Amino acid sequence: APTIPQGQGKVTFNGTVVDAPCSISQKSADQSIDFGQLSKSFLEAGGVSKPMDLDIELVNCDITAFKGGNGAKKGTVKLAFTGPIVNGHSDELDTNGGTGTAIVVQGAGKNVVFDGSEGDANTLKDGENVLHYTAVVKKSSAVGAAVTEGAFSAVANFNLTYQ
Amino acid sequence: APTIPQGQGKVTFNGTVVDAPCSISQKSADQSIDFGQLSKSFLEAGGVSKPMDLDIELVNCDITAFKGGNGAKKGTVKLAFTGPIVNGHSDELDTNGGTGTAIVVQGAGKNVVFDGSEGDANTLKDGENVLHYTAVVKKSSAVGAAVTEGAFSAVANFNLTYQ
Amino acid sequence: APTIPQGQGKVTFNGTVVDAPCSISQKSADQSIDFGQLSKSFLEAGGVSKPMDLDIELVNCDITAFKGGNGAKKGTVKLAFTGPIVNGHSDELDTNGGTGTAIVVQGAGKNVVFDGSEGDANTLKDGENVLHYTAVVKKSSAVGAAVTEGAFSAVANFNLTYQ
Amino acid sequence: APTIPQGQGKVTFNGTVVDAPCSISQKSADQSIDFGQLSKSFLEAGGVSKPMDLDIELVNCDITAFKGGNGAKKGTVKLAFTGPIVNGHSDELDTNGGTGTAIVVQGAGKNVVFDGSEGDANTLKDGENVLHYTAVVKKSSAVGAAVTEGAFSAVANFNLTYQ
Amino acid sequence: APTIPQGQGKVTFNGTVVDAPCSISQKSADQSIDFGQLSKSFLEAGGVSKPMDLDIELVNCDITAFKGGNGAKKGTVKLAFTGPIVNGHSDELDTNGGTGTAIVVQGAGKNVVFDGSEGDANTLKDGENVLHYTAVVKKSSAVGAAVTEGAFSAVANFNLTYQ
Amino acid sequence: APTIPQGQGKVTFNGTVVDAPCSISQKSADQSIDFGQLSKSFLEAGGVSKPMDLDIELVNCDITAFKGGNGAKKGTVKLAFTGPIVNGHSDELDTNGGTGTAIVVQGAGKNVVFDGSEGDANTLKDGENVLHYTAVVKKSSAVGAAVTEGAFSAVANFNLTYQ
Amino acid sequence: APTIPQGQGKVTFNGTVVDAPCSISQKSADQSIDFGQLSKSFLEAGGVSKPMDLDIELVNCDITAFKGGNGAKKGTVKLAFTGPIVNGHSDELDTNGGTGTAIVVQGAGKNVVFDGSEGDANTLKDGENVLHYTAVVKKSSAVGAAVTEGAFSAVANFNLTYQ
Lengths: 163, 163, 163, 163, 163, 163, 163
Known about the structure:
Chains A, B, C, D, E, F, G: It is found in: Secreted; Fimbrium. Chains A, B, C, D, E, F, G: Keywords: Disulfide bond, Fimbrium, Secreted, Signal. Chain A contains 3 helices and 12 strands, in the order ββαβαββαβββββββ. In chain A, strand 7 and strand 8 form a beta hairpin. By secondary structure, chain A is mainly beta. In chain A, 9% of the residues lie in helices and 42% in strands. A 4-stranded antiparallel sheet of chain A has the order 4-11-7-8, with no helix packed on it. Chain A has a 3-stranded antiparallel sheet with strand order 2-5-10. Chain A has helices at residues 26-29, 40-44, 64-69, and strands at residues 8-18, 23-24, 30-39, 52-53, 56-59, 76-82, 101-107, 110-111, 122-123, 129-131, 134-139, 151-162. Chains in contact: A-B, A-E, A-F, A-G, B-C, B-D, B-E, C-D, C-E, C-F, C-G, D-E, D-F, D-G, F-G. Chains D and G meet through strand 9 of D and strand 12 of G. Strand 1 of chain B pairs parallel with strand 3 of chain D, so a sheet runs across the interface.
């Protein structure tokens, strides 16, 4: 007897909301970079890998009322990256592994620092926006650094503030 | 002594079968949507997030013999979504949280209702099929609704019938 | 010790085969059309966007033996499009969104219908072939239709038969 | 008084080791396949579900010294699957349930048999490897087999040997 | 048994609509410029690359009723470019990289500024229109700027308004 | 007579609280790593398994007021791992079993030591944080160490302090 | 009270390094080929599909010092493909499925063999390089081979060595 539906399914929903004037798509909120396979000799020669796109897209920004009512806050943003750093460099990410290598993220004519400090303010427009960042791998600048024929793995976190 | 296999492993299998003329891949049977991070101000301004794909793929439908022998049942389907709804709206999903926000799923020129009722019949073809649905987040239409700077979480269920 | 290959990689392969006399390249099997950004006023004035190419290339058809042994089946094909349609029009695709707009695909001196029915038979030759189709956006012919300043999204499916 | 650590935690570790020349990741050692929801009519028509990936990845194989010192054993492997089988077929897995259905796993141009016997030897390379297998569901080939509108459940085990 | 269509395929559709009097083809909405390979010495000598076409085509403008009913708004448009800029220059795009180079986009007898401000109003006609822009690479005007033998990468965004 | 509820259920709740500025999810507070099945020969050759993720996520950190009022304590943390160690190495976990193998956990450009001592201070940001750690298995560095074809099992504990 | 960052995000990094003189982009390290839908009759007639690009790009090769110090090793490479093969052919990939079909990859005036053996040495230059390979589908050369109207699926692996 008991009736059986010809197709049962379920969908769930998740998200969050902040006081920001602009929204952040999950696709950019988190992400991962793969540098594939690198030549030791190349890195040992002080070489550097090709830049990877760490671009961050901002959506539904409508910073009109925002930049108006908030006065000085005229539609700029900045990021504060945090992670293990190479001593005396800061802008050099101390990857997790048994290698003498490191990762450097760059923004415009500046470098990214992973010491939790904020970077330069970035002007943005109404509606949609995107920040452009590049990441490369090189032999660490640490003293006595040496490239080990192993795997790479590193994690960096950042906060975004609006002005 | 006792011999030891050089690699032992195990694989299990699960599934089910119904009287439907078409099969449903697990990948669509259940799923989850993440709206990432939203701007309060934007939602408070009555704004709405970008559409998310809740598409449902149907496989091995071969509705030939089906639509023939079953007469009036000429190869259409419909969904009956069920969940908490906002009063006097029904098509507005009453998310679980301390926020004045809600989720609306849309199908074609119509909206989805989560009151357990069936939607419009949808013509399908032989072999493979897919239904197209979109989901967005907005400030709830509830009286006195207000957007709280917190997290979002909601669950909706649906049945699928064949005609 | 353990030796490490100087470059490891992997390639996978996928596809399928049917009783058709001609093969179908993946590039045409599935595809997507982007109409960019449209003027509301223009659409509201009953205007229509520019035609997009939905051409379908068929390869390795060699319909010699085919059209011979299969008699009446003298090297023609037809498509059966399926999707949400505007009532009383059928040839008008009921896009998914909160807009009063729709999509119309056209073939030769005829229009495409998304009710799952087959279109006109199309003569083809030996070796290589291609069908030519155009798609445009317009204000829906639905009663009380009105263009909303939002996004567009629609999905249509079709089967191909050989005669 | 008594001091309280500001965050206490614990991590455990498990695994095993064999005389194999190559290691086996847990992720492949065990696993599970879900075929979602199937059409009875389709199965009753003698239809068959889509192939599921039962691929087995082997890591750190370095079969150099191995294939050398072990002579005839020139870097091949094979699997011996074990489970309930359909009589007179063997390569057909007798699922556990009140349905007239069964599961068939396939490897290359051959089928997998669950009678505890070993399959064909598979050449592998140094470093990393992976075997490719597919699984499908069909109406059992058993005499008088009939598809019951219920659930599916089956378990199969296998050993891996190196040559 | 189960019937198999001789060719199954799927096509999707995307786009959006705004209150603009004219439509914008996707082909211009987004795009990319490649300056190929440049001579360091040349750039170091203060040289400048050849102009690249960043032209923006507007379609279905029919600004008749528009320019009429909207009075002062007599069929002109302007762009507001946004991106990283070189200090004290603004019209000089601070590319992302370890080079002392920059990009300058020019329009008519004026230069483009990437500070989010709007440029000069541009008269347009009924039906079809196109704006003409050029882009060149030069050694940055930044203090102490120097050309590094590396790669170039930059992203700029803009909004379009109608008057 | 006696009435019977149509569904009785019960839910319990557990947890704890410390003076830490940040909270610790149970999911990270405790956890377990499985290295699956390893090759003896590989380990005997001095090989090492692939890195496993022992990442520790910290939530609701809001270290604003914290890092302020606590002066020198400017938002850093460190871990003190404790367990059986291999003599003269310390950073090598003396697993429990009849094998000549051991486990090494690594953090950034440093290794983890299980002698109860604290590791390097790790800068963290406001809101959410995560530490990245890797674990591998190798043939123990103990004198006369030899890999036995058996099972692996080890337990390590750690405390977390905030500065 | 507790402060909430206006946008939190996280990025991870992965990769590896080998003793190779040249680096390998992930995009080529792994990949997948789709042959779309094929005609049975065509394959049965001994026909063959169109060639697919399996090109492998090598980056940052700088084989100057390499080819010098390593003497005989004057800047050549070769691949060793491994997978299921058709008996007495080797260069014919025994796809996984219930079809009488197979895949053949070709390089220059030679064919690729999936028996784990190395192919011909390929001269490469300094900086950037790319190898060109084609893949096609045909009716298997196996005895009694016959094309089944089903799906295709195959996996092949290879190592890269430098001389």
